[PDB]
RNA sequence: GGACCUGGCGGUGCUUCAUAUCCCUCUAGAGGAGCCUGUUCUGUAAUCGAUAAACCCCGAUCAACCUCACCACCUCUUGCUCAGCCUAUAUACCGCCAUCUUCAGCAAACCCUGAUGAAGGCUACAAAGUAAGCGCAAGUACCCACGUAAAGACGUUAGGUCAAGGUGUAGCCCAUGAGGUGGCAAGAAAUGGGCUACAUUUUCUACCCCAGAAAACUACGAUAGCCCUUAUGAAACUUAAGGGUCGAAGGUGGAUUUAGC
């Protein structure tokens, strides 16, 4: 019952990124150093690249939680400018007022 | 309750941010919003654990909606036994 | 902080439209709010997945969905203990046979935990959110079947069987089952002996003298098995003796004199069963008076703790005994003992509470000064309890006795706010009292303002099944309150309603109508007075007609009046 | 989703298109005007498809002097309640699709000759219950304006009379 | 027939009553309970402020009707049995740093919501002057080189801030452990300290 | 019609007077005060504690005032039961305004027969309160023309009282600098301390009565602190104007702002503190020279749709 | 979790405790299109083949 | 021209409320806020989770009290507690109100794991500020 | 067709004006060069929308994959959803805006005039207008009374957006839906806006304003190109930073034009 399929894909992406977070962290640690041999680092470069693409956190997109809008989103409220203003223009967001100075 | 208390007002903070006025295009026309945070520091002195416990509970429970609190407690301790003399 | 005397119980919404007016609404407004919490729990346990998510820190175990359905779907000894903690009587008894049929050994601690659930409910399912008369101990019940199957029986086995029979009014069989316990060289516990005294007397309706000998045998066996009695053991004896009102009087005291020696502080219930036994509908009540006085002094200045369920009933009983004795000094002690510590929670349920305050406020009005009686009426009502018609009528008979008839226009406004707007008996005692005697103008004009609000009530009534009916006295009084006040104009519009409903008008209303007409000096109106009385064939009208004729009557009217007769 | 749901007022306001460029200057035909309907008219609080009977809300709280418990209607009994409801709505539609036969005037679509009733009563205890009003002409006059352009206005001519020699007209 | 609302209990209220009993704890503005002709709102041309009945502006306000002076004085009179007396000996602050040279900092945060957690509550700051410690010339010179910028020469105060562990009781024990190893390591003279 | 002007009769306002008096005794029981000596200033203080509102508009906050200060004055019924208007100028529409012009014109005819600073004429908005009648601008001017005409004539004592009613008072704040209190240090030297502000710079200056013209800014000689000559010229300006260079010792401490903002802030501080060691006439010359006024020119904010404060993006 | 919010209020509407004015709207528009002939076809047995 | 939260002028037969009669540039000058929590304060967190609760609570109450809400909700948070304050019409019977109070309080307390209390203030008819 | 009314227009008149404004007048710029960036053409198997003022670093406070809607290939069928659709229509709409607005109008309800035509409605030594309400104004915010924000009615341009979301109507339903893998988003050319420069009021260094050098084919001048390294990331000739190499045009800009008290 999500807004659209685009939102649904991100939900799966974020779920698969939480399961492999530790596995990817442990494998990158080997790569991110000049201590271990290249032979071992070359084997870790193939292991972290064989994991599902949706486990990669760079594919996660911060969409709006009501309208699934990819751009124009405020991270503190996870809302689009259009949905934020609607609630702010009606005095529903504690502390939010229009600025004049 | 017999507690020494001093009151001052720290400078307020105003966080501002801008957003597009229209749903589509019209970039030059934007709307600005702000959040105003006002402070009030109550510096009590020479309390005890029991005295602070009931007083904080009393004021904390009656804290009104939209009002946060940050209680910083400076406790007096004594030097540990090991720090009194070196272990020759 | 104390109680707000101007507000209804906190549980209700503080709003005039949502405030419970009458006592029926009070109880019906809390049952509809409890029905929303049951309709929410229904939905919280039927669809848990919606509410499983937990965002609270620290975790709130009391805001999580319950899971009644069992999980272990296999057939082992540990899968049965999970159906006994969930009180699944049918599943456990059907799943026990399969386990027993297989031949797997069943511990003695697991079969005794099944009898407890069967002997307690009596092979019946407990009440669930959604899916008295007679004996509920069926002869073809699992409790007796599983009992025979068992290969070994310990003390707990019988102990939890005897208590299950007495609970479901199977008294006769429990005594037969107690003889076997004696044949197996066993020893019963206190709880098993408690139910054996209830069954003994209840089993047969014999004379008390025989029963007293019987009960003493169980107590002598209780001391022959190293068994120590508790409070409930004595409480049953007093409760059981209730039937023998007179005879038990002295014996019941003996029970109370053995509870002190062996160190058993009597609770509120122990005293509640003595007063009920002693209390009887007798005019002298000589014995009852002394008993309550001693009991109160002992209890005076004490704080109570729950021990037996009957403890709550004590307060209602004492006030009832105080209203029968018409003693207000003893009602201030009972109500003063309810305020100490947190004893105010023993008053009881809403039904018990209203009865207690009713009998209480009814003894205050009658007996004490009218200045304090109006201070108890402002405190209790409505914060403590909503009054019943008989309490407003009991208050009106105090003002009459205290020559304070100026508060009746305030007692009627309250009645309308407490659901007595359309109470015949209430309106029939307010009008007569106001119209009984003449009062100064300032006070006579106030009573007319209440008769114009009491008159509207008759015109508009909630029940339309029957035609509107006006009592003879009411119409007789509402009209005379207008005349004295000065509202003559409206006093003549009520004349038609007397004959319309065939309501006989009193002579005191006609005699006083002469002055109004004489001051007006309008014979026409005077003839109307004569015409109305003539319709009812009143004797005074014939004599009165002559006097009007002499004073202010037109010549033509005089001839017509005689013919009309 | 559940957060992309509006209210009835917002849904009808957008569906009717009463306020729009088309309405402003005779740009929309009246052949098939859309008509607002209240979907809450015949709805009872607590009545759903499952047929649950909620004490104190859907049904009486107490029955025979005792409080009721949560119950659910049977399929046979709930099927009779849905079909009897549909009658309620089916009625509204066609009833609201009949016509009030106005006594036509000179012509069927002509305003002239139609009665407007008696004039409104005056504030200082004045009434004209004996008078009758009849339309004579209804003209649609237009005027060019600076901003709007061509705005539509109505000119009406009426006559009033009591039937006893008193009569007058106005615009 | 149609239910009729009762008159407000404000009329019943007396002028010489006990207000705390009406508003013992925090509650929203109830016009039927508050016996004041208080108005709110911006008036229209030739108009007056809106009345309290149905006013949504007086419900937004977090009122202090439950915290009237009479109440506070009445509440705190009952809370004097919980408090303890501060040692009279400790008159000023200079005397508190003679018997208690260590000052521990700890912060609690109160925010609205279902969760009370806050990662900022684990930080513990320990301050202690080096003049209150039994240090010599060598120890004091070495202790200032290990702590780096944790020591302020202007105030001769060593500040230890610990946020490593989740709990605040673990960071307090870790700060007391760091003070001990630095004290016992400052007195220990190594063989590589001769090449200074 | 649904919209009707809220009309308040005398009976309604009479019931509001009783609810305020009873509410005034309740509010005193809450706060624990004496009802009798409970003024309106305490009500404003108690309503601001019990009902704390941070609304910028003070007319939108909770208020519990007397009904005569809330409800507006309304034109009372202007006729009896019979229907005859009391006043003889009812049908004019402005019976109060024309009765005043009729009275003023009648006093100007008697004069013929037998024959200032701090005050201003009643403003239009204040003249509609005395008459409870809406007045145009032109009608107000006509009334003022007759009053002035009255003053020119040799008006009697009674007439002066009549005109005085329409003459409101204006409190004019004397444009005089506030002299700082001369203090004395431990050694006994006399000085005066003042503060200045320029842009974002704030300065405190101590001016000793007797000195050798030594200035120390933040503990540094002024020529070292201010290399640019212009900055030094600003420092000299105050003293040169009062022709007393090399006679005082200054010790100032400026914080914030930039090079030129700090000098201006010190100039103003020294100038204000140097007014205590000069005559009143010299202080007025300093004021007329712009040495005691705080420059209100501060940076202007940038607008969301423009390149700058006032500069606009290039028009395509 | 839009599922939980969208499933709870769907169940509460079928139980009668929540009135969704948005579904009613689109329950009536889908009811007026069956009478107008604009009914969704059976899957597989579509206009195309 | 600006449209947000503004009720356009009409002949005069349209009744609007105080909150509905004021535009967004009066939200802190003539109006308050309908929700009051600490999420949006400097250095506070969980502003996006208090917001989602408000959007749902206003819809839950609008569909659970249909036709009974005279004005917008005023949500208040004090620690764990959440206080819903509402103005409602008197058309519905009290019996049904008490049912909805115990159903909504309980359901929302198990859903947001917090003590929820609802305070109704009945009004005869929708308070009218002015007629636009 | 004749004669009027209103409105618009006029290379229509008089008079008075424009304060960053129409023109002249003051200051820095644009168009000239290189780069960055958008658009249009062209191209590609390979989105959409805005597009005179009121489009053009516009939706995007942002595209390596994702975002993504596009293309090619493969796959699924009651399908995350009591389905679904970024499918058409902004000329059905809500919603949010632009614009005139750097305006002062707007208007219900009455009244009167014109013979009761559309229409119209002022003169203060006053001749038919009165007016709630909306706006302006006033209040408020920011450092005041100033100024700047904000606000700014009714209307206009069927202005903008069905691709924020929702939605009326028509249409698709083994496909106009859903998912996966790979991939394109270039530059002959033209144009808009911007950055950096053409230097000596400069360049480099020290300092942060009392200095010493430089200074035209090893000068000024690239944020470009080429090479390497690093950072982020699963993935970088590719994005960004830095270093090295390189040392171009350009030498002050035609017609015209922008902003600012
Ligand atoms: K023209
Ligand atoms: K240029
Ligand atoms: K260029
Ligand atoms: K539009
Ligand atoms: K659409
Ligand atoms: K859309
Ligand atoms: K350029
Ligand atoms: K350079
Ligand atoms: Mg790398
Ligand atoms: Mg704008
Ligand atoms: Mg026809
Ligand atoms: Mg600039
Ligand atoms: Mg493009
Ligand atoms: Mg791809
Ligand atoms: Mg598609
Ligand atoms: Mg459009
Ligand atoms: Mg201003
Ligand atoms: Mg602006
Ligand atoms: Mg303004
Ligand atoms: Mg070079
Ligand atoms: Mg380079």
């Amino acid at each position: 019952h999500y807004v659209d399929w685009r939102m649904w894909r991100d939900v799966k992406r974020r779920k698969m990124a939480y399961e492999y977070a530790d596995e990817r962290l442990r494998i990158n640690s080997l790569r991110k150093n000049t201590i271990l041999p290249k032979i071992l680092q070359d084997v870790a470069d193939e292991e972290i690249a064989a994991l599902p693409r949706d486990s990669c956190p760079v594919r996660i997109r911060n969409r709006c939680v009501m309208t699934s809008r990819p751009r124009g989103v405020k991270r503190r409220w996870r809302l689009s400018r259009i949905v934020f203003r609607h609630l702010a223009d009606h005095g529903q967001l504690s502390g939010i007022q229009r600025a004049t100075w | 309750l017999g507690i020494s208390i001093k009151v001052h007002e720290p400078p307020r903070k105003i966080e501002r941010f801008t957003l597009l006025q229209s749903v589509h295009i019209y970039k030059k026309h934007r709307v600005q919003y702000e959040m105003r945070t006002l402070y009030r520091c109550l510096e009590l002195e020479h309390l005890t654990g029991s005295t602070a416990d009931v007083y904080l509970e009393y004021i904390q429970r009656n804290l009104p909606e939209g009002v946060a609190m940050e209680v910083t407690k400076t406790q007096l301790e004594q030097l540990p036994e090991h720090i009194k003399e070196p272990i020759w | 902080v104390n109680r707000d005397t101007t507000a209804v119980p906190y549980v209700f919404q503080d709003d005039p439209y949502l405030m419970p007016a009458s006592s029926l609404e009070s109880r019906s407004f809390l049952l509809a709010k409890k029905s929303g919490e049951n309709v929410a729990k229904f939905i919280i346990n039927s669809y848990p997945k919606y509410f499983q998510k937990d965002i609270a820190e620290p975790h709130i175990p009391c805001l999580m969905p319950e899971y009644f359905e069992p999980q272990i779907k296999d057939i082992s000894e540990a899968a049965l203990k999970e159906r006994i903690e969930l009180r699944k009587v049918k599943a456990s008894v059907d799943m026990f046979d399969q386990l027993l049929q297989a031949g797997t050994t069943v511990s003695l601690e697991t079969t005794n935990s099944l009898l407890d659930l069967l002997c307690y409910y009596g092979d019946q399912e407990p009440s669930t959110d959604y899916h008295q008369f007679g004996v509920t101990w069926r002869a073809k019940n699992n409790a007796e079947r599983i009992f025979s199957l068992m290969p070994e029986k310990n003390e707990h086995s019988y102990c939890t069987m005897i208590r299950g029979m007495v609970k479901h009014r199977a008294y006769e069989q429990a005594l037969n089952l107690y003889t076997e316990l004696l044949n197996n060289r066993l020893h019963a516990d206190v709880y098993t002996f408690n139910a054996l005294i209830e069954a003994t007397v209840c089993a047969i309706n014999e004379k008390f003298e025989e029963k007293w000998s019987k009960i003493l045998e169980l107590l002598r066996h209780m001391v022959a098995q190293k068994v120590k009695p508790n409070l409930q053991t004595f409480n049953t004896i007093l409760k059981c003796l209730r039937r023998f009102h007179v005879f038990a009087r002295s014996p019941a005291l003996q029970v109370l004199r053995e509870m002190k020696a062996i160190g058993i502080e009597p609770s509120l219930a122990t005293y509640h069963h003595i007063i009920r036994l002693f209390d009887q509908p007798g005019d002298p009540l000589k014995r009852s008076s002394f008993i309550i006085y001693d009991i109160m002094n002992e209890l005076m200045g004490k704080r109570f703790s729950p021990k037996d369920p009957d403890d709550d009933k004590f307060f209602q009983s004492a006030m009832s005994i105080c209203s029968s004795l018409r003693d207000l000094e003893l009602a201030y002690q009972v109500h003063g003992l309810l305020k100490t510590g947190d004893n105010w929670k023993f008053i009881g349920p809403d039904q018990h509470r209203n009865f207690y305050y009713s009998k209480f406020f009814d003894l205050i009005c009658l007996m004490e000064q009218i200045d304090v009686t109006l201070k108890w009426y402002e405190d209790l009502i409505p914060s403590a309890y909503f009054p019943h018609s008989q309490t407003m009528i009991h208050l009106l008979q105090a003002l009459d006795v205290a020559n304070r008839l100026e508060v009746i226009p305030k007692i009627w406004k309250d009645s309308k706010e407490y659901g007595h707007t359309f109470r015949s008996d209430l309106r029939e005692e307010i009008l007569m009292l106001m119209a009984r005697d003449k009062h100064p103008p300032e006070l006579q004009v106030a009573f007319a303002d209440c008769a114009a609000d009491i008159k509207s009530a008759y015109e508009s009534q909630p029940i339309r099944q029957t035609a509107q009916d006006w009592p003879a006295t009411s119409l007789n009084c509402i009209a005379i309150l207008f005349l004295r006040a000065g509202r003559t104009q409206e006093a003549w519009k009520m004349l038609g309603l007397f004959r319309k409903h065939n309501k006989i008008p009193r002579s005191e209303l006609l005699n006083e109508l002469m002055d109004s007409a004489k001051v007006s000096n309008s014979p026409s109106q005077a003839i109307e007075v004569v015409e109305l009385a003539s319709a009812f064939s009143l004797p005074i009208c014939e004599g009165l007609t002559q006097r009007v004729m002499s004073d202010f009557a037109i010549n033509q009217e005089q001839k017509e009046a005689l013919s009309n007769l | 989703s559940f957060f992309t749901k509006l209210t009835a007022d917002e849904l009808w306001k957008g569906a009717l298109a009463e306020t729009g460029a088309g309405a402003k200057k005779g740009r929309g035909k009246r052949t098939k005007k859309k008509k607002r309907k209240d979907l809450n008219r015949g709805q009872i609080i607590g009545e759903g498809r499952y047929g649950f009977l909620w004490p104190g809300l859907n049904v009486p709280l107490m029955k025979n002097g005792a409080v009721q418990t949560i119950a659910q209607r049977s399929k046979e009994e709930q099927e009779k309640v849905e079909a009897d409801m549909i009658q309620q709505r089916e009625e509204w539609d066609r009833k609201k699709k009949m016509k009030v036969k106005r006594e036509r005037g000179w012509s069927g679509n002509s305003w002239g000759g139609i009665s407007l009733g008696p004039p409104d009563p005056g504030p200082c205890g004045e009434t004209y219950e004996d008078f009758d009003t009849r339309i004579l002409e209804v003209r649609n006059v237009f005027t060019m304006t600076a901003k709007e352009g061509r705005k539509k206005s109505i000119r009406v001519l009426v006559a009033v009379g009591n039937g006893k020699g008193a009569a007058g007209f106005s615009i | 027939p149609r239910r009729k609302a009762l008159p407000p209990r404000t009329e019943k209220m007396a002028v010489d009553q006990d207000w705390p009993s009406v508003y013992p704890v925090a509650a929203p503005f109830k016009p039927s309970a508050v016996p004041l002709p208080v108005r709110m709102g911006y008036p229209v041309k030739k108009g007056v402020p809106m009345a309290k009945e149905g006013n949504l502006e007086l419900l937004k306000i977090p009122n202090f009707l439950h915290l009237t002076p009479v109440a506070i004085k009445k509440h705190c009179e009952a809370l004097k049995d919980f408090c303890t007396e501060w040692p009279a000996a400790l008159d000023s602050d200079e005397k508190c740093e003679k018997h208690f040279p260590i000052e521990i900092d700890s912060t609690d945060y109160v925010s609205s919501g279902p969760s009370v957690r806050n990662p900022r509550a684990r930080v513990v700051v320990l301050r202690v002057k080096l003049s209150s410690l039994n240090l010599d010339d060598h120890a004091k010179k070495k202790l200032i080189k290990l702590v780096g910028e944790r020591y302020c020469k202007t105030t001769d105060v060593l500040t230890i801030k610990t946020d490593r562990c989740p709990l605040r009781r673990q960071n307090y024990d870790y700060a007391v452990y760091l003070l001990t190893v630095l004290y016992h390591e400052s007195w220990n003279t190594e063989e590589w300290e001769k090449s200074k | 019609p649904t919209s009707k002007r809220e009309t308040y009769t005398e009976d309604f306002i009479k019931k509001q007077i009783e609810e305020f008096n009873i509410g005034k005794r309740h509010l005193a029981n809450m706060m624990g005060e004496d009802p009798e000596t409970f003024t309106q200033e305490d009500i404003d203080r108690a309503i601001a504690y019990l009902f704390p509102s941070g609304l910028f508009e003070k007319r939108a906050r909770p208020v519990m005032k007397h009904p005569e200060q809330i409800f507006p004055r309304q034109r009372a019924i202007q006729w009896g039961e019979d229907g005859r208007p009391f006043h003889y100028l009812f049908y004019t529409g402005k019976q109060s305004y024309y009765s005043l012009m009729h009275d003023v014109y009648g006093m100007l005819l008697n004069l013929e027969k037998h024959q200032v600073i701090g005050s201003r004429w009643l403003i239009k908005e204040e003249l509609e309160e005395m008459l409870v009648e809406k007045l145009s601008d032109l009608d107000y001017m006509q009334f003022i023309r007759l009053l002035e005409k009255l003053l020119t004539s040799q008006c009697g004592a009674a007439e002066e009282e009549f005109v005085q009613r329409f003459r409101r008072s204006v409190t004019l704040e004397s444009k005089k600098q506030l002299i700082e209190p001369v203090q004395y240090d431990e050694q006994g030297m006399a000085f005066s301390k003042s503060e200045g502000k320029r842009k974002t710079a704030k300065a405190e200056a101590i001016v000793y009565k007797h000195g050798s013209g030594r200035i120390k800014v933040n503990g540094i000689d002024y020529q070292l602190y201010f290399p640019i000559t212009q900055d030094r010229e600003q420092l000299m300006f105050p003293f040169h104007f009062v022709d007393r260079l090399g006679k005082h010792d200054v010790t100032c401490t400026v914080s914030g702002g930039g090079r030129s903002a700090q000098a201006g802030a010190i100039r103003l501080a020294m100038a204000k503190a140097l007014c205590s060691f000069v005559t009143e006439d010299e202080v007025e010359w300093m004021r007329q020279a712009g040495l005691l006024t705080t420059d209100p020119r501060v940076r202007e904010r940038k607008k969301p749709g423009q390149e700058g404060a006032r500069r606009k993006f290039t028009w395509k | 979790n839009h599922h939980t919010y969208a499933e709870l209020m769907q169940t509460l509407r079928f139980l009668g405790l929540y009135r969704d004015e948005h579904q009613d709207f689109m329950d009536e528009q889908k009811r007026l299109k069956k009478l107008r002939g604009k009914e969704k076809p059976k899957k597989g047995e579509g206009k195309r083949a | 021209k600006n449209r947000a939260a503004r009720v356009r002028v009409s002949k005069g037969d349209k009744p609007v409320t105080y909150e509905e009669a004021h535009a967004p540039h009066y939200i802190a000058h003539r109006k308050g806020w309908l929700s009051l929590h600490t999420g949006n304060l400097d250095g506070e967190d969980h502003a996006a989770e208090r917001t989602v609760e408000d959007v749902f609570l206003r819809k839950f109450m609008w569909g659970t009290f249909p036709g009974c809400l005279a004005d917008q909700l005023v949500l208040k948070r004090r620690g764990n507690q959440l206080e819903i304050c509402a103005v409602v019409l008197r058309q519905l019977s009290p019996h049904k109100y008490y049912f909805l109070v115990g159903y909504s309080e309980t359901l929302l307390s198990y859903f947001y794991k917090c003590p929820v209390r609802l305070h109704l203030q009945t009004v005869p008819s929708k308070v009218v500020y002015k007629y636009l």
Side-chain angles (χ1 to χ4, degrees), chain H residues 1-58:
Chain H
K1 27 185 183 159
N2 301 318
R3 315 280 313 190
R6 292 167 176 73
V7 172
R8 297 281 142 176
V9 71
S10 185
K11 164 169 294 189
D13 302 335
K14 185 199 314 184
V16 299
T17 56
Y18 180 89
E19 315 297 320
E20 176 184 2
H22 288 93
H25 57 282
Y26 288 135
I27 287 178
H29 310 255
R30 304 182 185 183
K31 303 171 56 177
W33 292 287
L34 293 169
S35 187
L36 267 183
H37 54 86
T38 70
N40 286 340
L41 285 165
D42 192 47
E44 292 291 331
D45 296 327
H46 320 301
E49 315 201 47
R50 300 297 84 77
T51 309
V52 169
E53 300 175 353
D54 289 354
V55 174
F56 165 83
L57 285 171
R58 300 185 192 274

Side-chain angles (χ1 to χ4, degrees), chain E residues 14 17 39 41-42 63-64 67, chain F residues 23 26 29 49-50 59 62-63:
Chain E
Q17 62 165 356
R39 303 172 159 263
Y42 196 86
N63 63 61
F64 285 75
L67 294 171
Chain F
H26 269 114
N29 178 49
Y49 168 78
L50 301 173
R59 279 184 288 182
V63 65

Side-chain angles (χ1 to χ4, degrees), chain D residues 86-157:
Chain D
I86 280 191
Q87 239 297 354
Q88 281 303 300
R89 178 208 65 241
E90 270 198 359
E91 199 166 3
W92 258 240
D93 208 4
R94 45 171 171 295
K95 149 260 174 184
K96 202 185 170 193
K97 276 175 186 164
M98 301 287 203
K99 192 258 179 300
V100 188
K101 303 179 180 180
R102 62 176 182 183
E103 170 189 300
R104 73 168 168 265
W106 306 334
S107 303
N109 216 50
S110 178
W111 276 109
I114 278 170
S115 186
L116 289 172
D120 311 332
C124 196
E126 306 194 35
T127 57
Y128 319 86
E129 308 172 11
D130 197 358
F131 282 79
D132 180 24
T133 309
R134 291 202 173 268
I135 309 172
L136 296 174
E137 190 196 17
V138 176
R139 190 187 288 267
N140 285 359
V141 296
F142 300 80
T143 192
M144 198 67 44
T145 58
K147 281 182 175 178
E148 296 196 341
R150 192 172 175 256
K151 67 172 191 171
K152 173 172 152 291
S153 168
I154 310 289
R155 191 182 87 202
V156 179
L157 175 58

Side-chain angles (χ1 to χ4, degrees), chain C residues 63-169:
Chain C
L63 287 178
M64 308 299 301
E66 288 178 351
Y67 295 96
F68 316 99
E69 302 168 352
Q71 304 168 357
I72 307 178
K73 296 190 61 173
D74 63 46
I75 294 193
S76 55
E77 179 181 0
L80 175 73
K81 292 180 182 178
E82 172 198 340
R83 281 164 186 78
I84 297 180
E85 292 301 323
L86 307 172
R87 303 183 173 181
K88 296 279 192 167
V89 283
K90 295 311 177 180
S92 59
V93 171
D94 291 346
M95 163 168 171
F96 178 78
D97 306 353
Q98 302 178 3
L99 192 150
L100 183 51
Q101 198 165 3
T104 74
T105 67
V106 62
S107 185
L108 183 53
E109 312 172 26
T110 303
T111 176
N112 273 345
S113 292
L114 181 63
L115 287 173
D116 291 9
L117 177 55
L118 296 180
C119 291
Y120 195 77
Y121 284 88
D123 291 347
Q124 291 182 319
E125 309 168 352
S127 295
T128 60
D129 289 344
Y130 183 55
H131 160 68
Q132 311 184 44
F133 194 59
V135 174
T136 321
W137 190 247
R138 304 171 296 270
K140 298 176 180 175
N141 60 22
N142 296 334
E144 307 171 8
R145 179 174 62 77
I146 299 185
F147 193 61
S148 60
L149 308 186
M150 291 173 46
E152 181 195 45
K153 307 174 182 182
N154 56 341
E155 318 88 39
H156 184 294
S157 57
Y158 302 79
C159 296
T160 186
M161 193 69 183
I162 294 184
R163 296 173 64 187
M165 295 178 172
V166 173
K167 177 175 192 298
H168 299 100
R169 311 193 188 188

Side-chain angles (χ1 to χ4, degrees), chain E residues 32-53:
Chain E
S32 40
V34 188
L36 299 171
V38 64
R39 303 172 159 263
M40 193 172 181
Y42 196 86
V44 288
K45 267 81 174 184
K46 291 184 179 178
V48 294
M50 305 272 289
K52 56 175 176 170
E53 305 90 15

Side-chain angles (χ1 to χ4, degrees), chain C residues 274-287:
Chain C
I274 282 184
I275 61 187
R276 291 292 191 182
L277 180 51
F278 267 99
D279 183 2
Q280 190 168 356
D283 288 0
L285 280 199
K286 291 206 168 190
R287 296 131 200 177

